[PDB]
Amino acid sequence: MKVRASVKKLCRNCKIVKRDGVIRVICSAEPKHKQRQG
Amino acid sequence: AKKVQAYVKLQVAAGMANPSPPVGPALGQQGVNIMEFCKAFNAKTDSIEKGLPIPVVITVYADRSFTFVTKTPP
Amino acid sequence: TSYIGGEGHNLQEHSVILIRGGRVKDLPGVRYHTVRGALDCSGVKDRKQARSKYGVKRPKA
Amino acid sequence: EKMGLALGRLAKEDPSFRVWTDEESNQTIIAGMGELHLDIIVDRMKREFNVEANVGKPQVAYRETIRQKVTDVEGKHAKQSGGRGQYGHVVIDMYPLEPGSNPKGYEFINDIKGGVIPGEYIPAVDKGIQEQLKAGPLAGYPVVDMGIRLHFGSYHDVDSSELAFKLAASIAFKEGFKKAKPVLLEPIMKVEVETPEENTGDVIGDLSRRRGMLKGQESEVTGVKIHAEVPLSEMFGYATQLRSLTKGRASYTMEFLKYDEAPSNVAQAVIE
Amino acid sequence: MLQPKRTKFRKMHKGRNRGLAQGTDVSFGSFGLKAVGRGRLTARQIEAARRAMTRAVKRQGKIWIRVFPDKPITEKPLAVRMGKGKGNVEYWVALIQPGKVLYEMDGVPEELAREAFKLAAAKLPIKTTFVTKTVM
RNA sequence: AGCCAGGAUGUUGGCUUAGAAGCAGCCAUCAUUUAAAGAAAGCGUAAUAGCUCACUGGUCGAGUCGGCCUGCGCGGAAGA
RNA sequence: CGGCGAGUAGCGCAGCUUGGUAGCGCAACUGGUUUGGGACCAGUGGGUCGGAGGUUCGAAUCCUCUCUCGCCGACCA
């Protein structure tokens, strides 16, 4: 995946999470949108 | 002509029977024969106006049988 | 350098030939010939006259 | 010498691969059925006839023509030294001819009316322009579509000879090029591909990737054939590069159509 | 690149950036970007931010560049011992204070301009916001 | 917000007529049939088809949705 | 890098000192001469001063800022 300081929902089905307090943008449809560390 | 099974939006020109260039896999994607299509489509094309930019709908059944509805020019 | 007598040559930088004796007297260097009826330069496009030279099969017709 | 022999005693095994010899570059060109077909043959000589022939890559032609019109281009040759004193002056204009299917990329119409340039010198400049057309001012590649019309000029009494005007035409000729900025012409192929039903699409992008301008796809009972235009440069390896796409089921063929001005990406990549 | 053509002097003092700017209104159009920061914009950034917008509409609307450099900045040549005269003019900048309206845009719906300014800001250093023309 | 539905008629709309059929884009950005449906928000195609959403039906049954100004936190944050 | 010397017709040099008018030689076009060219004899055109900003009535000129181009040297641990 990709780590950045700014992570935005790219797809419509990109979702936001706070697992372990670390922001993640895990999706459900497409892989490439999975990103974190934002 | 049931729910969406085997038809597309075509009939470039009824005046030119068996149209190759601008059609191509437009109806041939399914496996539609062109020689059989000459049979029915020409059967009423001679009776109606020809060569007008007009579409037709051709729906093929499971046993290799079809049907049509000749339409209105855009 | 050698000579190909007759408008029937068909070679460019390759294609083995045969060699026979004879210069040409006007071409500086040429001292040999080709046997028309050999490797890569056979007869000269169907000539009937004195064709034991320029070697083309006669008119079979 | 024994490589020309090598094939002649290997070609016997199979007519499937043929043999060429470069029209312009005197380099033999091997043809075949596929990489597998060719691979073993390389060893068939590398061992049987002892031939570590450095297996290169197929080669190119790359024509070149003018981009636009010219304005005045003129000839002038004056080296006297008394005894000779050859002085020939001409003033032509060449134009980018109509790109036509005829092989007549040369056409010199004589516009001179009266004795400004003697009639016995048209052949000289005529001889002149045509030979220089094998000296494309990039690296000497086939030049065409040069609309040449000779306008005005001069000559030297008693003196002026063919030498003056045949060469002086060229000096003028070169200017039309060094001033109207020609550019390459790449040969273009028409390639037809039969693709069943399933990889049809994905094949197109591959061809599209090859700068291939799509023409049209026509469907039949089994296999949609595709008419396609593609630059010959992008064409090498295609067969395997295609059968690996069509799971070894397709059949492509090559037809020449026309010559295209090679783009920047390809253009500068000939200059040497 | 915008640059004061032919002014009074070439080199001018470092100066200071105190207070609040003058232009605080959306004067010419309907929408404007106000600078909530306090810094120094360079000419390079200016034209850069212009491109983001000039591209954000492609051809519609009118764009007003409120600020203008008017300040020359110098720099000493690399690795020269300090002293030995004043620097050499490198590039020009426009001082900025909070409450200054920088780019004023009109001709497009509030929507795109809102989006357009989101592109200009990413090239400018100082934090800025989007403000609109109001009555009196 | 979930659970079952619908989501259409002309309309392949030009052109570069090779082709952009709601989905490359350039324009209009319609009217009808309506409980409703945009000549289109995304996925998918050479170009379609296929899969959803807008909005609308019913059921369930109580609050729910989106911006504005700040306080205080997280991430950005890796050296012998 | 800083820093004293050049930038003028097609080519090479003048003219800048002390501001007022752009020249010499060769090149180039034209004519004579000769069987013709070279050569040699006559006539003429050609820049308007590297580019920009100043100062004066007046800027090729005297000053400033950039560019292109030569020379001097960018040393002492």
Swiss-Prot record, chain A:
GO CC aspect terms: cytoplasm; cytosolic large ribosomal subunit
HAMAP family given in the database record: Ribosomal_bL36 (MF_00251)
Pfam families: Ribosomal_L36
Subunit structure: Part of the 50S ribosomal subunit.
PROSITE patterns: RIBOSOMAL_L36
SUPFAM superfamilies (UniProt xref): Ribosomal protein L36 (SSF57840)
Keyword Heme: no
GO molecular function: rRNA binding; structural constituent of ribosome
Source superkingdom: Bacteria
Job description of the protein: One of the last ribosomal proteins to be assembled in the 50S subunit, it contacts a number of helices in the 23S rRNA, acting as molecular glue. The simultaneous presence of uL16 and bL36 probably triggers ObgE's GTPase activity and eventual dissociation from the mature 50S ribosomal subunit.
TM regions (residue ranges): none
Annotated source species: Escherichia coli (strain K12)
Keywords in alphabetical order: Ribonucleoprotein, Ribosomal protein, RNA-binding, rRNA-binding
InterPro entries: Ribosomal_bL36 (IPR000473), Ribosomal_bL36_sp (IPR035977)
Family: Belongs to the bacterial ribosomal protein bL36 family.
GO biological process: one example: cytoplasmic translation
PANTHER family documented for this protein: 50S RIBOSOMAL PROTEIN L36, CHLOROPLASTIC (PTHR42888), LARGE RIBOSOMAL SUBUNIT PROTEIN BL36C (PTHR42888:SF1)
Protein name per Swiss-Prot or TrEMBL: Large ribosomal subunit protein bL36A
Phylogenetic lineage: Bacteria, Pseudomonadati, Pseudomonadota, Gammaproteobacteria, Enterobacterales
Curated annotation (Swiss-Prot), chain B:
Presence of keyword Ribosomal protein: yes
GO MF entry, a single one: structural constituent of ribosome
GO biological process, one term: translational termination
Residue numbers bearing the N6,N6,N6-trimethyllysine modification: 3, 39
Disulfide bond sites: none
Keyword rRNA-binding part of the UniProt annotation: yes
Modified residues (N6-succinyllysine): 71
Sequence positions bearing N,N,N-trimethylalanine: 1
Described purpose of this protein according to its UniProt entry: Forms part of the ribosomal stalk which helps the ribosome interact with GTP-bound translation factors.
The protein's name: Large ribosomal subunit protein uL11
Shown residues in whole-protein numbering: 2 to 75 of 142
From Swiss-Prot, chain C:
N6-acetyllysine modification, residue list: 45
Misc. comment: At least 19 substitutions or deletions in 11 codons can promote streptomycin resistance, dependence or pseudodependence; all but one of the streptomycin resistant mutations (K42R) are associated with hyperaccurate translation and thus reduced translational efficiency. The streptomycin sensitive allele is dominant to resistant alleles.
Record protein name field: Small ribosomal subunit protein uS12
Quaternary structure, from the entry: Part of the 30S ribosomal subunit. Contacts proteins S8 and S17. Interacts with ArfA. May interact with IF1 in the 30S initiation complex.
In-chain residues carrying the UniProt-annotated modification 3-methylthioaspartic acid: 26
Biological source species: Escherichia coli (strain K12)
Family the UniProt entry places it in: Belongs to the universal ribosomal protein uS12 family.
Function statement: With S4 and S5 plays an important role in translational accuracy. Interacts with and stabilizes bases of the 16S rRNA that are involved in tRNA selection in the A site and with the mRNA backbone. Located at the interface of the 30S and 50S subunits, it traverses the body of the 30S subunit contacting proteins on the other side and probably holding the rRNA structure together. The combined cluster of proteins S8, S12 and S17 appears to hold together the shoulder and platform of the 30S subunit.
UniProt lineage: Bacteria, Pseudomonadati, Pseudomonadota, Gammaproteobacteria, Enterobacterales
Curated annotation (Swiss-Prot), chain E:
UniProt keywords, alphabetically: Hydroxylation, Methylation, Ribonucleoprotein, Ribosomal protein, RNA-binding, rRNA-binding, tRNA-binding
GO cellular component, one term: cytosolic large ribosomal subunit
InterPro entries per record: Ribosomal_uL16, Ribosomal_uL16_bact-type, Ribosomal_uL16_CS, Ribosomal_uL16_dom, Ribosomal_uL16_sf
GO MF, one annotated term: rRNA binding
Residues with PTM (3R)-3-hydroxyarginine: 81
Stored Pfam families: Ribosomal_L16
Alphabetical list of Gene3D superfamilies matching this protein: Ribosomal protein L10e/L16
Residues with N-methylmethionine modification: 1
The keyword Ligase appears for this protein: no
UniProt GO BP: cytoplasmic translation; ribosomal large subunit assembly
Chain coiled-coil ranges: none
Post-translational modification: Is hydroxylated on Arg-81 by RoxA. The modification is nearly suppressed when E.coli is grown in anoxia.
Similarity field: Belongs to the universal ribosomal protein uL16 family.
Self-association state and partner proteins as the record states: Part of the 50S ribosomal subunit. Cross-links to the A and P site tRNAs. Interacts with assembly factor DarP(YjgA).
NCBIfam families: rplP_bact
Functional summary from the UniProt entry: Binds directly to 23S ribosomal RNA and is located at the A site of the peptidyltransferase center. It contacts the A and P site tRNAs. One of the last ribosomal proteins to be assembled in the 50S subunit. The simultaneous presence of uL16 and bL36 probably triggers ObgE's GTPase activity and eventual dissociation from the mature 50S ribosmal subunit. It has an essential role in subunit assembly.
HAMAP family in the cross-refs: Ribosomal_uL16 (MF_01342)
Name recorded for this polypeptide: Large ribosomal subunit protein uL16
